[PDB]
Design a protein around this nucleic acid. Structure first.
Lengths: 251, 117, 88, 88, 112, 183, 100
RNA sequence: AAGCUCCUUCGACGAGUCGAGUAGUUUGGGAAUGCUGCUCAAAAUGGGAGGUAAAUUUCUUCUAAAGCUAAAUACCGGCCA
RNA sequence: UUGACCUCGGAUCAGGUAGGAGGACCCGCUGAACUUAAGCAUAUCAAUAAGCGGAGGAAAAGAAACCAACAGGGAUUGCC
């Protein structure tokens, strides 16, 4: 048995955590944090931008990984996260923002590296059909299979997924036990804090038909483009005013 | 904002009128050598890149090979009769081609070309 | 933006994205036979002949440093196996 | 310089486990130590700390080992107490 | 584009058996909340209430998870004699403790 | 077309032929002096594309420089010190270019192309007589060779703002307070 | 065709330790009867204690595979085997990177 | 000797160099801003940079590791005025 | 035996060349601290002063592995 799993029913899940070339130090810090919580996953270096998106499939086929967590950066400012089932499964593309990695000295919590977490999902994941696809992909990426020989024996942290806006809010908490007053659980945030807004869901590893479109996604470049157009608009307004003033001065 | 030693790098432009006379005399020297020729070279009309300035035109570096051929001016003779040539610029639109071709025909109408020897 | 009449532009000789020179491919193929192989390519050749295609790609990337470089080098050495079998 | 006990500083989870924490300003139950075995474990640590640095590797091992056997006897004794109380 | 038939078809292809009547909680360790978190968030810009809402959702899942795990017999509490690696290093948590000392010192020195 | 075959051979430095030749040649250079004249380029294709001609006035001097660091890192290159040392020995010559021939684990070997500016062949021939002008004295000492241009950062773009057109000159330009007559 | 998530005989995680103890120092557990915990929640006990005479013999004449390290799985010193020693000999001389 | 025009023929373009990892230094600039040392070490419808959620990494723009070049610019020194 | 080639040498051999000075401005290397601010440390002074090497009437740079996203610009240098 090459699965590194000792359990009655084997849920064999291997994850490939992969980063693109133009990631920032903050993006890399987020990737390192997620890799630590994933004992069945392995890190991967910068990925070529000029290549094809399904080249991630034979790359993951190379390492015997059936789940790909892909970090894609644009302009060295933006982060995009892909979750995929490597041969054929569905693929979802997110825009990641509001990143607060570990090593920020305002969390006060800690947990075992590789311990099996409690996955806290929201009621919204059970109703919307597209949120149900993301729920299964999250359960595979953060599963930490039961009998894995790299995990830890005792459970002390909970990973929570919430849907408040048209976004998914990811938080990680430590399960702290306190003796009851004549044991109850208190939670302390320990880990990465980031927001995911779903862009697209495609059947197929990194292609195929589109099964969901956001239709409300506001790109960070769209915000930038409007600012540039506003600056040009002001200049054109001043130029038009001068032309009208010269015409009326002649009159 | 004087946290560095600014006093040792302070440039005073007391030679502003002196340099202007020097520049005017240098322009006169070029006219002395190129007596009937103009002291400059004919340059094309180009559009500013940015959307802030794309509604305004200016002077470019030199004329494109395509618009030089449409005018009827050979490549190797253009720098010799006072026309600047730019081999890096592309036309990409008939509007830029027509504007500079017409500019060249206007230059040819006003030209007085002397026999070689 | 503005509406202008687009123009068709002549092909640039600076384009190297066309049919590459047949002579340089000849020189590369001839020289590779003459020179031989590097020690790290010998390891890849043994791995490919033994059938360890997965290990061949992983080792090549470690030596080269890019997925694309590992893929091209493994494809290049695969052709040498095919030709050497045909030559033998 | 002020004591961390005086300040209401939260306890932090580290390689040393926090364990089950007790609420502040409440009854932290007194866990009495009266068994000879329980006293032996505490005594071995105190003696080891006072002795400090020992140059011999074997003598250092024996000092650590006697604490281990003291812990094992205490754990065995407390286990037998639990079985007797649970059964009888 | 919202292809519900296609989305449910895609889910069926990669779905694992998570049904409680045949799959114990130790296998998946996933809890789906009964209430909606956004119903307890009136304004999303209110940071204090938003983070409190997320904490409450995770608190219930941890509470239900502990009850189910202890019924199944999977160990839950970390023993005091279990020293192992963490997600945050010793140096990181030493920095965290030091900053808490500094804030407390400043607050108490102000009163003095 | 022999030089095109040599270009491909020099690309495969770990091949059996090139590794063998580099092993034996490394031992031979080590038995010779640190700086000695080479009667002929060992990489004729590389020397040719760097400007070497088989005229009277062109010489090759090969040199080995100890590799490593001073944890401090020298801002110039090991190739820069190789050219500078050869120029001092041949004080009458002008350094044109240099190229790598061998490394070894203790040294690093380069061959330097030099041109004699006082030779009639060089002075009468264009394409090289520019080096006869006095503004090209000790180019390797001023960073005017290919290695110096790379070290100085003389490239165009937004990645070379601080160092193109001279790093120190740019700093002086940015830190000079200019006061006009009509302020 | 789907992927089989198994570890090939050349992965970094092909052989994983039973100690379930990370990169932390072994100074913890020094005064404890056990050394680490397995993945089932049960503590791994120290195997035994070697004779004092055997320790003196090892100090006087170091074993062939002596490294000075401590095995996290079993608190006894970690010793190289014959096949491993051949591998270090092969690499440090470079004569035979691989057999056959 | 030279410029062009046409074409049922051809059209060679720089390697211990890019690049990956790491250490020091530096910049407003971990898509490492640049440089240097060490380990490994390339390609040919290739390579570099950039744009882009727009459904795949499409599109835009250049051609590195060889070299020369006046002028506008600096000047407490040299010959003077 | 003789004679080529290669490589390495001798000569107060025939003809040349370099060193030193100057260094205001210029091209590189190397390289501080006082000082300023802040629990501390990084930072600041400064990629400066001192030190070393190399040019000229100017030097350096320079004819895109550039800027851009445009209806596009088109080597370098300098002023606003």
């Amino acid at each position: 048995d090459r699965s590194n799993i000792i359990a009655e029913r084997k849920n064999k899940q291997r994850v490939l955590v992969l980063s693109s070339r133009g990631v920032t130090y903050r993006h890399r810090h987020l990737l390192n944090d997620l890799a630590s919580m994933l004992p069945h996953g392995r890190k991967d270096a910068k990925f070529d931008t000029k290549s094809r998106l399904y080249e991630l499939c034979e790359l993951a086929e190379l390492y015997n990984c059936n789940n790909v967590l892909f970090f894609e950066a644009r302009k060295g400012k933006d982060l995009y996260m892909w979750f995929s089932k490597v041969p054929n499964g569905p693929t979802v593309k997110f825009y990641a923002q509001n990143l607060h990695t570990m090593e920020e000295l305002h969390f006060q919590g800690n947990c075992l590296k590789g311990s099996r977490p409690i996955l806290s999902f929201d009621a919204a994941f059970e109703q919307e059909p597209y949120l149900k696809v993301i729920k299964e992909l999250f359960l595979h990426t953060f599963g930490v299979p039961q009998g894995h020989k790299k995990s830890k024996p005792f459970i002390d942290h909970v990973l929570s997924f919430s849907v408040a806006d048209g976004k998914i809010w990811v938080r990680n908490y430590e399960i702290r036990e306190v003796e009851k007053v004549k044991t109850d659980i208190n939670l302390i945030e320990i880990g990465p804090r980031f927001v995911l807004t779903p862009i697209i869901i495609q059947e197929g590893s990194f292609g195929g038909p589109i099964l969901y479109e956001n239709k409300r996604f506001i790109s960070p470049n769209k915000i930038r483009a409007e600012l540039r157009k506003a600056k040009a608009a002001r200049h054109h307004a001043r130029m038009e005013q001068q032309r009208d003033l010269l015409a009326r001065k002649r009159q | 904002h004087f946290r560095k030693h600014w006093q040792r790098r302070v440039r005073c432009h007391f030679d502003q009128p002196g340099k202007k006379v020097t520049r005017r005399l240098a322009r006169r020297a070029k006219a002395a050598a190129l007596a009937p020729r103009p002291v400059d070279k004919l340059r094309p009309i180009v559009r500013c890149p940015t959307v802030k300035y794309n509604r305004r035109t200016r002077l470019g570096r030199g004329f494109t090979l395509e618009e030089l051929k449409a005018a009827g001016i050979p490549r190797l003779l253009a720098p010799t009769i006072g026309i600047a040539v730019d081999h890096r610029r592309k036309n990409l639109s008939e509007e830029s081609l027509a504007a500079n071709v017409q500019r060249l025909k206007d230059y040819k109408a006003r030209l007085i070309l002397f026999p070689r020897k | 933006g503005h509406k202008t009449t687009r123009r068709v532009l002549k092909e640039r000789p600076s384009r190297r994205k066309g049919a590459q020179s047949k002579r340089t491919q000849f020189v590369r193929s001839l020289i590779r036979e003459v020179a031989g192989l590097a020690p790290y390519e010998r390891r890849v050749i043994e791995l490919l002949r033994n059938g360890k295609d997965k290990r061949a790609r992983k080792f090549s990337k470690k030596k080269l440093g890019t997925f694309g470089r590992a893929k091209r080098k493994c494809e290049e050495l695969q052709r040498i196996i095919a030709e050497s079998r045909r030559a033998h | 310089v002020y004591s961390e006990k005086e300040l209401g500083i939260p306890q932090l989870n580290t390689v040393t486990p926090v364990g089950v924490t007790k609420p502040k300003g409440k009854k932290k139950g007194k866990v009495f130590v009266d068994d000879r075995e329980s006293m032996n474990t505490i005594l071995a640590m105190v003696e080891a700390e006072k002795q400090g640095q020992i140059e011999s590797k074997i003598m250092r091992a024996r000092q650590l080992e006697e604490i281990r056997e003291a812990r094992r006897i205490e754990a065995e004794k407390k286990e037998a107490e639990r079985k007797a109380l649970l059964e009888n | 584009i919202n292809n519900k038939e296609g989305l449910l078809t895609a889910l069926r292809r990669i779905q694992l058996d998570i049904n409680p009547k045949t799959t114990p909680f130790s296998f998946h360790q996933s809890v789906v909340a009964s209430k909606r978190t956004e119903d307890s968030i009136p304004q999303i810009e209110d940071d204090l209430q938003r983070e409190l809402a997320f904490m409450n959702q995770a608190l219930e899942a941890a509470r239900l998870g502990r009850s189910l795990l202890r019924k199944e017999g999977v160990p839950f509490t970390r023993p005091t004699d279990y020293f192992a690696e963490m997600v945050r290093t010793d140096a990181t948590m030493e920095k965290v403790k030091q900053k808490l000392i500094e804030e407390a010192t400043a607050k108490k020195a102000a009163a003095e | 077309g022999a030089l095109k075959y040599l270009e491909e051979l020099s690309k495969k430095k770990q091949s059996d032929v090139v590794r063998f030749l580099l092993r034996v040649r490394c031992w031979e250079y080590r038995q010779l002096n640190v700086i000695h004249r080479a009667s002929r380029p060992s990489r004729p294709d590389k020397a040719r594309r760097l400007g070497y001609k088989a005229k009277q006035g062109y010489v090759i001097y090969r040199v080995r420089v100890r590799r490593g660091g001073r944890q401090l890192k020298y801002q110039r290159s090991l190739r820069a010190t190789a050219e500078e040392r050869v120029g001092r020995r041949c004080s009458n010559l002008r350094v044109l270019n240099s190229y790598w021939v061998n490394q070894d684990s203790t040294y690093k070997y380069y061959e330097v192309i030099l041109v004699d500016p006082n030779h009639k062949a060089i002075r009468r021939d264009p394409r090289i007589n520019w080096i006869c002008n006095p503004v090209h004295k000790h180019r390797e000492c001023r960073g005017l060779t290919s290695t110096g241009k790379k070290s100085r950062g003389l490239n165009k773009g937004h990645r070379f703002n601080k160092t193109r057109a001279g790093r120190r000159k740019t700093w002086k330009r940015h830190n000079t307070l200019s006061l006009w007559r009509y302020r | 065709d789907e992927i089989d998530p198994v570890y090939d005989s050349d992965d970094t995680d092909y052989n994983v330790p039973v100690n379930t103890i990370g990169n932390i120092p072994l100074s913890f557990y020094d005064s404890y009867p056990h050394i680490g915990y397995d993945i089932n929640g049960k503590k791994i006990m120290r195997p035994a204690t070697g004779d004092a005479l055997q320790n003196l013999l090892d100090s006087i004449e170091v074993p062939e595979g002596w490294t000075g390290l401590t095995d996290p799985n079993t608190g006894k010193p970690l010793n190289l085997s014959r096949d491993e020693l051949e591998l270090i000999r092969k690499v440090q001389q470079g004569l035979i990177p691989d057999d056959v």
